[PDB]
Amino acid sequence: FHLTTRNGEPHMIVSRQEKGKSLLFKTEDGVNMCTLMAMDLGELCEDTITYKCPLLRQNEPEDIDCWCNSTSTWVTYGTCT
Amino acid sequence: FHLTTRNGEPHMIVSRQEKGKSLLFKTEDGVNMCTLMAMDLGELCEDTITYKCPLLRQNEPEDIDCWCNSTSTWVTYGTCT
Amino acid sequence: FHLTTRNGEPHMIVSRQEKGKSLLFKTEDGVNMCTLMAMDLGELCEDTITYKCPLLRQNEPEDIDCWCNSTSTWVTYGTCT
Amino acid sequence: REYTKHLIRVENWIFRNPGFALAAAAIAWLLGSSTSQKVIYLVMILLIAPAYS
Amino acid sequence: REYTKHLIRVENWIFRNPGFALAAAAIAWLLGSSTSQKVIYLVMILLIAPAYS
Amino acid sequence: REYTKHLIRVENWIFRNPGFALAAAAIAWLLGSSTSQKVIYLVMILLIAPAYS
Amino acid sequence: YFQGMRCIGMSNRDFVEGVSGGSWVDIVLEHGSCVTTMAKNKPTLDFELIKTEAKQPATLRKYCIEAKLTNTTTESRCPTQGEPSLNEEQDKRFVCKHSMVDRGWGNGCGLFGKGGIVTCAMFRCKKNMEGKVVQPENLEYTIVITPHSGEEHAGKHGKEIKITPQSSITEAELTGYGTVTMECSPRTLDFEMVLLQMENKAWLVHRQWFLDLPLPWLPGADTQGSNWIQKETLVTFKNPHAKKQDVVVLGSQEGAMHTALTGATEIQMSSGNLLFTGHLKCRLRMDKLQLKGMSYSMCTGKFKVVKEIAETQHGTIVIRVQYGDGSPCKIPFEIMDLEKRHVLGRLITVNPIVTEKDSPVNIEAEPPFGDSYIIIGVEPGQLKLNWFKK
Amino acid sequence: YFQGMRCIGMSNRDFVEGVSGGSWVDIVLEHGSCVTTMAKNKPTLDFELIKTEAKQPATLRKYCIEAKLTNTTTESRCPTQGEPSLNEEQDKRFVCKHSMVDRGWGNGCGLFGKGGIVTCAMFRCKKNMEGKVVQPENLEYTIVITPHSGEEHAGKHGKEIKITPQSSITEAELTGYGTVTMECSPRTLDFEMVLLQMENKAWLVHRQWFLDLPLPWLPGADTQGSNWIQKETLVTFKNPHAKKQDVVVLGSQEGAMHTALTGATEIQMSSGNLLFTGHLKCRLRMDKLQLKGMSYSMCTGKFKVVKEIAETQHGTIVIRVQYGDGSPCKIPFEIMDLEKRHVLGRLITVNPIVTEKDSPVNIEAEPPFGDSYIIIGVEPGQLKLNWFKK
Amino acid sequence: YFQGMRCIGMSNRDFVEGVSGGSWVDIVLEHGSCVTTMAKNKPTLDFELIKTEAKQPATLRKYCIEAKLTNTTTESRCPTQGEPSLNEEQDKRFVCKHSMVDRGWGNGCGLFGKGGIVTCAMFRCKKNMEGKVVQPENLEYTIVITPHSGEEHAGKHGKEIKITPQSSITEAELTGYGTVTMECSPRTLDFEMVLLQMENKAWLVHRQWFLDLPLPWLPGADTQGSNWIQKETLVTFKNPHAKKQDVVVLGSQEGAMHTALTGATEIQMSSGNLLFTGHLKCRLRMDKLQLKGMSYSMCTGKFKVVKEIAETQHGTIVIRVQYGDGSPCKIPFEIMDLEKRHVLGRLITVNPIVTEKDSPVNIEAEPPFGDSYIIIGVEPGQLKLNWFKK
Amino acid sequence: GALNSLGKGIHQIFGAAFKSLFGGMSWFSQILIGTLLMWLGLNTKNGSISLMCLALGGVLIFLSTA
Amino acid sequence: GALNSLGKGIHQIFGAAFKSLFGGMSWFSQILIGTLLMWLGLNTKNGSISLMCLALGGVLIFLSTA
Amino acid sequence: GALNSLGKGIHQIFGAAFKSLFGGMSWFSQILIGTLLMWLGLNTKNGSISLMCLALGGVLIFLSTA
Ligand SMILES: CC(=O)N[C@@H]1[C@@H](O)[C@H](O)[C@@H](CO)O[C@@H]1O
Ligand SMILES: CC(=O)N[C@@H]1[C@@H](O)[C@H](O)[C@@H](CO)O[C@@H]1O
Numbered sequence A, B, C: 001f002h003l004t005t006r007n008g009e010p011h012m013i014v015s016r017q018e019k020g021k022s023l024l025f026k027t028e029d030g031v032n033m034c035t036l037m038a039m040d041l042g043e044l045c046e047d048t049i050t051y052k053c054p055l056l057r058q059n060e061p062e063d064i065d066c067w068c069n070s071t072s073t074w075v076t077y078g079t080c081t
Numbered sequence D, E, F: 001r002e003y004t005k006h007l008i009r010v011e012n013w014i015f016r017n018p019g020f021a022l023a024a025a026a027i028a029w030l031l032g033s034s035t036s037q038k039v040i041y042l043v044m045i046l047l048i049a050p051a052y053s
Numbered sequence G, H, I: 001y002f003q004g005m006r007c008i009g010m011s012n013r014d015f016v017e018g019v020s021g022g023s024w025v026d027i028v029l030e031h032g033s034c035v036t037t038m039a040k041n042k043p044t045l046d047f048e049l050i051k052t053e054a055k056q057p058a059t060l061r062k063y064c065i066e067a068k069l070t071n072t073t074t075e076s077r078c079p080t081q082g083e084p085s086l087n088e089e090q091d092k093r094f095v096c097k098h099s100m101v102d103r104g105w106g107n108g109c110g111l112f113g114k115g116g117i118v119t120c121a122m123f124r125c126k127k128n129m130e131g132k133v134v135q136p137e138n139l140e141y142t143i144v145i146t147p148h149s150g151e152e153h154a155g156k157h158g159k160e161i162k163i164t165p166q167s168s169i170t171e172a173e174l175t176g177y178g179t180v181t182m183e184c185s186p187r188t189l190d191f192e193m194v195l196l197q198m199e200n201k202a203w204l205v206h207r208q209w210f211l212d213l214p215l216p217w218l219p220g221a222d223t224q225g226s227n228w229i230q231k232e233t234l235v236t237f238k239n240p241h242a243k244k245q246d247v248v249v250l251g252s253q254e255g256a257m258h259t260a261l262t263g264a265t266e267i268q269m270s271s272g273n274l275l276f277t278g279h280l281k282c283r284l285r286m287d288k289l290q291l292k293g294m295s296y297s298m299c300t301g302k303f304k305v306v307k308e309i310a311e312t313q314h315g316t317i318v319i320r321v322q323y324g325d326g327s328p329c330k331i332p333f334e335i336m337d338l339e340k341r342h343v344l345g346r347l348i349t350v351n352p353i354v355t356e357k358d359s360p361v362n363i364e365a366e367p368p369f370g371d372s373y374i375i376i377g378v379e380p381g382q383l384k385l386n387w388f389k390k
Numbered sequence J, K, L: 001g002a003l004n005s006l007g008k009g010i011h012q013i014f015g016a017a018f019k020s021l022f023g024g025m026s027w028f029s030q031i032l033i034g035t036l037l038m039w040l041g042l043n044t045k046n047g048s049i050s051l052m053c054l055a056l057g058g059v060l061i062f063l064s065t066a
């Protein structure tokens, strides 16, 4: 995935071949591990969706398919197939 | 994943920990490599879905999230999380 | 933060610069660690809110953004920015 | 007692004797011979009946 | 030619002389003096007019 | 001045003498003796009054 | 606390009596009312229709109102190769749909064009409702026949009998008095209607509305509970894709149903049975009834009016009394005029008797209008109680 | 520029005169109109009702229309342990609410279930409005009594007097002429109504509407301005959470109020006092008034008509003149016929006099209809001015 | 094949003639009809209104009927922290919605409760339709003025002229005959209506219906084609989730539109212009027209009737003839009685002439009713053709 | 049903009147005053005979209950 | 109020007519022409006497202002 | 419009009849047979005079076209 930013915050452009794998990227505050569970994750195209993966410390996830454990991150991926 | 069959054809029961990784299994006609891109791939449970991953020889994939390159294969996975 | 009391119970006046950090203060019964997760935590001003951070022993938190692990504590912070 | 004391006496004496009523109309119909004017008797008679005056 | 040869002769001779028609009615109205019975003349006359018989 | 010069003369001479008006009606009511026809006098009189002709 | 009190405390109470002997007497029974019957030398009886319920009425149709989907499977063919198929398309537990979807080189086909696709999902009902048909017959009315004795309690139930418009004439035994014979008719309650049951709560609904409900259903006489009809009503098939298609099920319809039934007459129920407020017409014969206690002694002793004489809602009175000098005996009751010359009024409680020493024996009687003496007992202290009925 | 001009320039002007001597004369005073009174050997006076205002009318209710919240505090108990409480729930400056919220192991409770929660916030009003009740009495009418002299200015105000329907008969002094005595009645103005004040701008509104307004309020006789009633009208309590609950206050209602009062009669005001257009009926006596200047000399000199004689809206004329040979003197005015034989018309300005040499002395007079000579002055050049009144 | 034939072949043909000289003659022009005018010593002319179209009519509103969505973005805040926002919420190309969604420990919030969420997607219109307003003025009528000569073809077009109800009197030149002057009025066609254009196919629709259409639109005078109004009409926002929300766009509405316009009068069109069937009233003057060919020789030769004399739908005949001995000459035409004594009937073709040897010269004439001789030519073989008009 | 509607209708009115005018007593009391009326039906002359001869049956029936 | 409405109503009309017909002068002028009318009320014969004998009061009152 | 509807209506019928009965010729032919009819209107006696004296105008007008 391409690591960029959105208003000072880290942003992940996730491609199709990354579905199902732990997303890791270094940050001043250590190594960040985001987890992508999006069922509709497809091919990067015009039909993108973009949203935030909250920071989750010792809390079970609820009503979400993306989250990081060290620093909140934005994520973007296409839905095409 | 558990390799079984469905009417003489190979069938893949894919679990959650395989999301994002190339699926390889030996067959009389050489080694088969299926590619799973299902965004909704989750935990194996009661809510399964089952469908076919077509054979694709030098053709770009379109409107699909699963395909093999040597022998058409059926795939099954749960959507739970 | 300023440590005071509210009816015999410990009370924490939390300022803006403490957002995101573990709150520790000594007590006869050992060291108390309260966790503040308030998203709306801002600058100390006239618009304060004050409420209690329950004691939580080996139980996951639910429907709360403040809790301590040794002795229930009151907390107060402003919402200004 | 003053409210029912004049009435209760009559409501007894009739229950003892139905008779003076039965023939009262005869005294009535032969006296005054017009409707109401012949009724006021049949009330006046059955009323003076349980009395001693 | 046998279909129009009897008609065409008349349709000419009138276009040459309107007259025998104009006075025909006078011969008509003074002959037979009833409606149709007075019309059959005004046809018979204007018809015998372009003839030589 | 030609607009009010004929009127203003009258509007004075009456304000000096109310009288010729007061008796005018007497000349009126005894002359012509019908409504309007008896009014035209009471205008003609009070009008010829402030005049010398 | 005493036998026959229930009917005395009711506002709707009919007094019936036979104008003949050995003849039939007609009475009308209604919920919330009671009928008191009387006859010369016969005990007075109380009748009440307490329950009217349908037992095991025919189940018309079971409607599924909430379901789940499992094992969703998709199959599709390329343009030119006919309609695909799945064997589970023959399994009555699945919901399936046939469609057409674009195909081409990108998904395994030689030609670009529409191809046939089919998708099936196992349908599992999780919550259903059922509508039943109540037949006028097979309805069961419960009637209690209580002896109007005045005896006490605070072990003396009236005979309870259950009948059906198809059952024959009933011969009910009343411990101590004999038997009473009666027959009833459900004389005018309608049933082209249906009774809808949504988890122990029921409603009366019109037919053709129940039958038109857009929900999966099964013929009444089923037990599999699997082969649902018109499952598509709770299932939605999303637009297909070359090789897969999603299928989602609607959410529970219990709510859509509830706030949809508001207005229709709600029907009470219990133990799975439906309850109604019935109406009966009956005829009874008392030739086999007789007074309990004839051939005793005439109490020769004393009574102390237990408490304040009571006035009922029916021009009658209830006098509590308790012996005193004697055997479990007959009581001398008699309502006369102020002069004690002639007998007036009458007893509703008949052949009133005492069973125990210090056993309040309630007695219901009808005093004439006006003044009367209530003479209870015999010659030590014959109890003259004055009474005025307004 | 001259005394008595204001009334001459008014279109609504009444001329009143007493048919007796020493008697009372009635007049009707209205805003925008004036009344001129005259009497034999008495000065002519002008009367005008210029102001009608309520002074310190009773305050009925203060409504808060904008507020702020501070120190929001929450307290809650587990299922089973009763209703929680906060002592500030006894402090009248706070708004509080009691509710129930789910509780359980996740937030410090042994049992899962509903628990009692309470939240309070200090309520601070930032902008309020107040409605007042105007009593017919305590209303104060201002009346100006100006001497109709014609004197000049461009120091000579008419006497101003303020009265109340409860004040006694007034004795007003007019420098130079004596005093005039008068009494007034607010003779028919209604007050079941109320006067709403929204920051120096007021309106007249019906009662029961003012009293029904859904806004926090305080009884009129308050000064704390803290213990508001029904604060919840400007406060909203969000759904609670196990241990905290948010409370927000509505925004200012000044706007919702303004565009809500459109239609109701707007009432002017100043210095906190409300103003109205009153109506008065008065009676006055002039027995204590007298002409200013009697016992002077009869000007024996000349006058030059300062400018063009003016015609008023009341069949009268205003002649400006200025001496000339003499003392500050009486003027010889007289309107006769063309022949100068009899006197016609009359003066509205009475005992016209000159105070200074070169001091335009305006004079209002009433010429008869038609022709007349306006004779100003004496025998050097008695000023014959012709006049025609149409 | 000959000049003036078009009008002869029409069933709707009016014959007009001026009752004066140099005067104006009125005629009524309709689509599908023609008018033939005649005057002493003037050529006969044919008039036809062939086209009526609106040129560049004002565009009222552009409606989007099919769109796509891209870059869908979601933002949401925890309970207590106000309404979230996205800067693209200020970009007119996006469609956005604000909502509330449950939040809590499971998705990054300290408190459980409703939180603010916002979602935007770029809206891209892919197919739109536009309704236009046709003004009576700016309508352009095309009229063809053809000389009724009978000359041949199989290079001789009638003059075509385009006018507007705002254009001034027209002076049309007819090669060889001079000019004809005429003025027209759109004398009674309505336009509170609108003309809807769905990809080169148009309809006439009522206003307020067009303006009420639930579809994204843009004010007529736009060119950006991006800042659509009420995009939500083609967009649906699914129920939100803690941090994301789906947005889908409806499918094309071209179909819903088509099968929705059935019934409304369909309007033809081409080259972007709308066409109508107009109605005109005109007045023309012929003082500047003259016969083409005066001052020639009178053919002195022969003619062979090219083919069968034809009867028109208007009591007239068309005789084809071709010279023969002479110059391009005048023709001697004359319809007399059987005796050749007086002249009967008249020519519609006037000053008929021959341009070439072997050049069929059609001639339209009006024979009297009954019998007549059609005398074509001169003294070698003056062509006596018998004719009977029924 | 109308016939049942008016059935209680015409009866309650005519009934109460009979529960007041007559209604003195029973047995040898009712039958006598009863039987004497039936005599008036046979005799009399004038029409009332139409009511009396019926009223007897009214009484006798109430005596014939038994 | 009606009585007050018509009060100015019936007065303004009847008034102006009296402000034209009469209205010549005052004092010994008004009283005379006034007093003579009151004579016509006592005498005369015909009904107008109903108006004249009133009209005197009309004048005399305006002379009785003082 | 009715008046326009029947306008062509009453005209076409009455017209064709006039396009047959008369319709011989024009100029000195039409006027003569025309003028003689107008004579019958002045004279005659019987009602037809109502039609003839009109029919003249019918002819004369067609001769007055010019
Ligand atoms: C704050 C925290 O938990 N840090 C660790 C990080 O060091 C590690 O790389 C990752 C997975 O290996 O798990 C967490 O993100
Ligand atoms: C038919 C074909 O292409 N065979 C190869 C297979 O041998 C290999 O294992 C795989 C990935 O390594 O890629 C293809 O499947």
Ligand SMILES: CC(=O)N[C@@H]1[C@@H](O)[C@H](O)[C@@H](CO)O[C@@H]1O
Binding pocket: C030, C031, C032, C033, C069, C070
């Ligand atoms: C009761 C208990 O668990 N005590 C410990 C405390 O000693 C420690 O300081 C803190 C974090 O270090 O974690 C808990 O509060």
Ligand SMILES: CC(=O)N[C@@H]1[C@@H](O)[C@H](O)[C@@H](CO)O[C@H]1O
Binding pocket: A029, A030, A031, A032
């Ligand atoms: C503190 C930190 O971020 N460093 C390491 C990170 O590099 C590593 O990936 C992870 C487990 O693999 O453990 C973290 O502690």
Ligand SMILES: CC(=O)N[C@@H]1[C@@H](O)[C@H](O)[C@@H](CO)O[C@H]1O
Binding pocket: B029, B030, B031, B032
């Ligand atoms: C022919 C075949 O299937 N064998 C090998 C396969 O084992 C291997 O995984 C792949 C690349 O890794 O290359 C294939 O050629």
Ligand SMILES: CC(=O)N[C@@H]1[C@@H](O)[C@H](O)[C@@H](CO)O[C@H]1O
Binding pocket: C029, C030, C031, C032
């Ligand atoms: C019992 C107690 O409260 N003492 C220590 C505390 O000082 C320390 O901060 C914590 C871990 O850091 O471990 C606790 O055991």
